[PDB]
Design a protein around this nucleic acid. Structure first.
Ligand SMILES: [Zn+2]
Ligand SMILES: [Zn+2]
Ligand SMILES: [Zn+2]
Ligand SMILES: [Zn+2]
Ligand SMILES: [Zn+2]
Ligand SMILES: [Zn+2]
Lengths: 140, 142
RNA sequence: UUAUU
């Protein structure tokens, strides 16, 4: 059940090893957790009213990619282009919904995008998109 | 599988619903999260040197069971008698290492402790203990 | 494809 943990937790909290100068995954940057705020991801959520807490498609124009700060903060309804575009790649709408074009290795992981590839490697690894009620209503 | 989620997470964080009287899993207290501080457990951890962050056997005498406070907090090397004895029961050393004496119901859950039961129901549900390097030494000598 | 541009 790795999908749940990535959707809920990927890059949402700071790496405790990094603050102790002990994270081996800073360069190149491959950690599960954020090291700087400009690498922080907001958990993507579908609210009870059927809307996403933020869009899977429209990028915020005020988000400061260098500092990880948006004037509207986390309540911003638009997508933030954080490091590695992880708000989009790990969004309920898109995470693991397409097939990865890259080969799969013997442990079932991506040969090119590393352990955190957000494309699917095999049927067990594919999920159906979750849609905003507004996308569903457009699809009609 | 579900073992890792219990080991790492069970009753380690405060329930955001309970603080608002919106948790429906209080009495019968089936919530995965703590509601009162004395229900909170610290995640047990095997350090790189092979020792546990805190013992699964020797109980802290400073831990106030009424308030859930120990002066050493997460760094106390001794076991806290949290409500339901959850630090011991969900410890790496003991969680699901033995068979529950109680029976399972028709959903696959313990009849006395429900789905959260810390003993294994069926040999398929067993895990091997994780041992402190010290216990490994004493055990080998037998 | 949400990392095939
Ligand atoms: Zn790290
Ligand atoms: Zn924004
Ligand atoms: Zn891939
Ligand atoms: Zn609760
Ligand atoms: Zn203590
Ligand atoms: Zn039981």
């Amino acid at each position: 059940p790795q999908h749940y943990t990535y959707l809920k937790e990927f890059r949402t909290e700071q790496c405790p090893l990094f603050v102790q100068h002990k994270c081996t995954q800073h360069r190149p940057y491959t950690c599960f957790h954020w090291h700087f705020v400009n690498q922080r991801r907001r958990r993507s959520i579908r609210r009870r009213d059927g809307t996403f807490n933020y869009s899977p498609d429209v990028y915020c124009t005020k988000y400061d990619e260098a500092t990880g700060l948006c004037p509207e903060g986390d309540e911003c309804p638009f997508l933030h282009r954080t490091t590695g575009d992880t708000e989009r790649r790990y969004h309920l709408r898109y995470y693991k919904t397409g097939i990865c074009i890259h080969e799969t290795d013997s442990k079932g992981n991506c040969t090119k995008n590393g352990l955190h590839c957000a494309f699917a490697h095999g049927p067990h690894d594919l999920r159906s998109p979750v849609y905003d009620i507004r996308e569903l209503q457009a699809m009609e």
